């Protein structure tokens, strides 16, 4: 079948492992599906497409991905089989090749895929193509808790698919890979089971979004919706996180840090428009802040407008000691502002008529309302550098961000309609993803919004491993969803996985 010598598994690794541990003999019976082992060949694909690419391990089997937390190592082969769904009137081939555990990377052209030990399968085959996945290695056994270099199966479209197609769907030929352990798979050394393994699928909090908290403005979340009208690729700086647990930009762990800052009180009176305080920013946990990777201290607002912090004012004037006054802060440029949170200084101005005898100390600020709010990056520096998180994209053709809109306290003088700020992930997911620190498998999760009472889907969205949710919308009108469901992770998908139209 394939030009490879037989590869010794647990007989080479035996004289140097304390134990060689057997597996339930009912696991060598079933062909269980491989994660990311599915594809679809449309007649618009060019030969050379790489349909799947998956590496021999215990991550290919849900039985073994779970058994492989009790142990230290593994060795041995697997049996995979590729099923293809095409009738007698299709035409096209698919080459499945065994790539050795090195051989770096890059565009494998179809000229080069036929140079490995391979198998060339017609699309219109009946019974599933069975082929081995040998354990070619430099070492005696492998360690389960450390992804290493093992043999890959790479599938490539050799010649394109020639069929007819009615008007919809367009007849894609589907295919699925299913694996099981060969007769000589073994784990090595029984350890006590650990929970923070690497084959541990991303789970989400069981919390309805209406019960969540917003990420950019400290308020509850009042509605999740799609909206093809707003800027499709924003550059928010709060509520940015990586599904692998890395905080992006000025996103804080806590939700009390959102739109807030702990500052140094440097008070001095002035006979112009009122009192003006210059604040020397620090990190709200009390640690010395230095200009670094973030565009501002952790949690500093990321919107543009007229914000009004409150206080920590100790007044030595007789009659009262500690009060709560309302300062005022400008976030937009306005072409007259020394706004540089980056370097650790902000200017606040209250319109007072007399002297407020305020002691200099350490304060922290709480937003009260906003005047003239624009969804646009503020001035983290005057007109200067800002190492900031990139925009929120890119999306496939026909996919729009899913926003968690809340409403902030507006100071208005012309209307009363509530304004909607929105983020990509409520402040519960930003803490979940950081506290768990999962292992990103491919490129994008596949969530599934359900209703807990009824038990019916609402939509199938896609959480990219960069920390935002997309959704395949066709229309143009803002379509708002119920806010009483639960997000449920299904599986890992590639980037190009096309959703179902909502």
Ligand X SMILES: C[C@H](CCC(=O)NCCS(=O)(=O)O)[C@H]1CC[C@H]2[C@@H]3[C@H](O)C[C@@H]4C[C@H](O)CC[C@]4(C)[C@H]3C[C@H](O)[C@]12C
Which residues of the shown chain bind another protein in the complex (CB under 8 A)?
A: 3, 14-20, 26, 29-33, 35, 62-63, 72, 83, 85-91, 93, 110-112, 114-115, 117-118, 120, 122, 124-126, 143, 145-146, 159, 162-163, 168-169, 171, 173-174, 176, 178, 189-192, 194, 455, 488, 490-491, 500
Does 409 contact ligand X by CB under 6 A?
yes
**C-alpha gyration radius of the chain:** 29
| Stretch of 104-112, 313-321, 350-358, 456-464 contacting a copy of itself, by CB under 8 A | 313-321
Cβ 374 vs Cβ 304: under 8 Å: yes
Residue 412, marked binder? yes
Chosen from ligand X, another protein, a copy of itself, none, partner binding at 88 (C-beta under 5 to 8 Å by type)? another protein
Chosen from a copy of itself, ligand X, another protein, none, partner binding at 363 (C-beta under 5 to 8 Å by type)? ligand X
Q: Quick one: 236 exposed, middle or buried, by C-beta within 10 A (0-12, 13-18, 19+)?
A: buried
Does 451 contact a copy of itself by CB under 8 A?
no
> How many residues are there in the chain?
502
Q: CA–CA separation, 91 vs 382, rounded Å?
A: 62
Chosen from another protein, ligand X, a copy of itself, none, partner binding at 412 (C-beta under 5 to 8 Å by type)? a copy of itself
Q: How far is the CB of 37 from a copy of itself (least distance, A)?
A: 16
Q: Which residues on adjacent β-strands are paired with residue 407?
A: 420
Q: How far is the CB of 397 from ligand X (least distance, A)?
A: 33
Does 144 contact a copy of itself by CB under 8 A?
no
Does 286 contact ligand X by CB under 6 A?
yes
Q: Which of 88, 183, 206, 290 forms a contact with a copy of itself (CB under 8 A)?
A: 206
Residue 498, marked binder? no
Can you list the pairs that 328-332 forms with residues at least 24 positions away whose Cβ atoms lie under 8 Å? Answer: 330/305, 330/306, 331/301, 331/303, 331/304, 331/305, 331/306, 331/307, 331/378, 331/379, 332/304, 332/305, 332/372, 332/374, 332/376, 332/378, 332/379
Other beta carbons less than 10 A from residue 34's beta carbon: 22
Residue 415, marked binder? yes
Does 322 contact a copy of itself by CB under 8 A?
yes
> Hey, CA dihedral for 51, 57, 61, 66, is it positive or negative?
negative
Cα 263 from chain centre = 32
| Beta carbons within 8 Å of 69's beta carbon, 6+ residues apart | 144, 193, 194, 195, 197, 199
| Identity of the residue, 345 or 448, whose beta carbon is nearer to another protein in the bound complex | 448
Q: Which of 120, 219, 266, 479 forms a contact with a copy of itself (CB under 8 A)?
A: 219
The 8-class DSSP code of residue 138 comes to S
Per-residue string for binding with ligand X, 309-328, x by CB under 6 A?
-x-x----------------
Q: How far is the CB of 70 from another protein (least distance, A)?
A: 9
Does 414 contact a copy of itself by CB under 8 A?
yes
Q: Which of 69, 95, 131, 262 forms a contact with ligand X (CB under 6 A)?
A: 262
After which residues does the chain have a break in its backbone, defined as C to next N over 2.5 Å? Answer: none
Per-residue string for binding with a copy of itself, 233-252, x by CB under 8 A?
-------------------x
Element (H, E) at 40: strand 32-41
Q: Which residues on adjacent β-strands are paired with residue 464?
A: 444, 468
Q: How far is the CB of 308 from a copy of itself (least distance, A)?
A: 8
| Stretch of 83-91, 234-242, 271-279, 407-415 contacting a copy of itself, by CB under 8 A | 407-415
| Beta carbons within 8 Å of 97's beta carbon, 6+ residues apart | 113, 114, 116, 117, 118, 119, 153, 154, 155, 156
Residue 147, marked binder? no
Other beta carbons less than 10 A from residue 87's beta carbon: 10
Q: How far is the CB of 406 from another protein (least distance, A)?
A: 30
Can you list the pairs that 465-468 forms with residues at least 24 positions away whose Cβ atoms lie under 8 Å? Answer: 465/242, 465/243, 465/244, 465/440, 466/242, 466/243, 466/392, 467/240, 467/241, 467/242, 467/243, 467/248, 467/424, 467/425, 467/433, 468/392, 468/401, 468/402, 468/424, 468/425
Does 465 contact a copy of itself by CB under 8 A?
no
Select the residue whose beta carbon is closest to ligand X and give its number: 366
Measure Cα distances from 141 to 106, 370, 499 in Å.
28, 61, 40
Q: CA–CA separation, 186 vs 24, rounded Å?
A: 11
Q: List binding-site positions for Ca(2+).
A: 410, 412, 419
Site residues (vs a copy of itself, CB under 8 A) = 19, 21-27, 30, 62-63, 66-67, 69-70, 190, 192-193, 195, 201, 203, 205-207, 210-214, 218-220, 222, 252-257, 284-286, 310-312, 314, 319-324, 326, 368-369, 409-416, 428, 431-432, 434-435, 437
- Binding-site residue ranges for Mg(2+): 410, 412, 415, 419
Task: Return residues touching ligand X (CB under 6 A).
Answer: 219, 222, 260, 262, 286, 310, 312, 362-364, 366, 407, 409, 418
């Amino acid at each position: 079948a394939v030009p490879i010598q037989p590869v010794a598994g647990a007989a080479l690794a035996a004289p140097a492992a304390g134990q060689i541990n057997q597996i339930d003999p009912w696991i060598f019976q079933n062909f269980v599906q491989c994660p990311l082992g599915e594809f679809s060949i449309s007649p618009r694909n060019t030969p050379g497409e790489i349909l799947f690419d998956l590496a021999l391990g215990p991550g290919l089997n849900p039985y073994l991905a779970h058994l492989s937390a009790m142990y230290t190592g593994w060795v041995g082969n697997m049996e995979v089989q590729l099923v293809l769904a095409g009738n007698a009137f299709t035409a096209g081939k698919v080459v499945v090749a065994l790539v050795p555990p090195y051989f770096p990377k890059g565009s494998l052209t179809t000229a080069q895929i036929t140079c490995f030990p391979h198998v060339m399968c017609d699309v219109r085959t009946l019974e599933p193509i069975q082929l081995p996945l040998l354990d070619v290695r430099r070492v005696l056994w492998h360690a389960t808790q450390d992804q290493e270099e093992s043999m890959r199966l790479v599938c490539m479209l050799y010649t394109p698919l020639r069929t007819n197609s009615p008007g919809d769907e367009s007849f894609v030929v589907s295919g699925r890979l299913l694996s099981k352990p060969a007769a000589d798979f073994n784990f090595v050394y029984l350890t006590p089971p650990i929970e923070r393994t690497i084959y541990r699928m991303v789970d989400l909090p069981v919390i309805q979004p209406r019960l969540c908290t917003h990420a950019r403005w400290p308020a509850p979340v009042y509605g999740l919706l799609v909206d093809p009208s707003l800027p499709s690729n924003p550059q928010w700086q709060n509520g940015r996180v990586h599904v692998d647990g890395t905080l992006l930009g000025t996103t804080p762990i806590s939700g009390s840090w959102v739109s807030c800052f702990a500052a140094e009180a440097a008070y001095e009176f002035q006979s112009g428009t009122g009192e003006v305080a210059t604040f020397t920013l620090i990190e709200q946990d009390g640690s010395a802040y230095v200009p670094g990777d973030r565009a501002a201290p952790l949690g500093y607002p990321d919107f543009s407008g007229q914000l009004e912090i409150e206080v920590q004012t100790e007044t030595t004037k007789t009659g009262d000691k500690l009060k709560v006054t309302t300062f005022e802060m400008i976030l937009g440029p306005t072409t007259n502002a020394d706004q540089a949170p980056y370097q650790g200084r902000v200017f606040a101005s209250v319109t007072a008529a007399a002297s407020l005898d305020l002691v200099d100390g350490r304060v922290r600020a709480v937003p009260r309302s906003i005047y003239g709010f624009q969804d646009t990056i503020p001035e983290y520096n005057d007109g200067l550098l800002v190492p900031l998180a990139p925009p929120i994209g890119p999306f496939l053709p026909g996919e729009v961000l899913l926003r968690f809109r809340t409403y902030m306290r507006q100071i208005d003088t012309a209307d009363a309609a509530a304004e909607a700020i929105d983020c990509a992930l409520p402040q519960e997911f930003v803490s979940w993803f950081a506290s768990n620190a999962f292992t990103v498998q491919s490129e994008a999760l596949l969530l599934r919004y359900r209703n807990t009472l009824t038990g019916q889907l609402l939509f199938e969205c896609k959480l990219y491993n960069e920390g935002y949710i997309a959704l395949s919308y066709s229309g143009s009108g803002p379509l708002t969803f119920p806010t009483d469901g639960i997000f449920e992770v299904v599986s890992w998908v590639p980037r190009l996985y096309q959703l179902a139209s909502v």
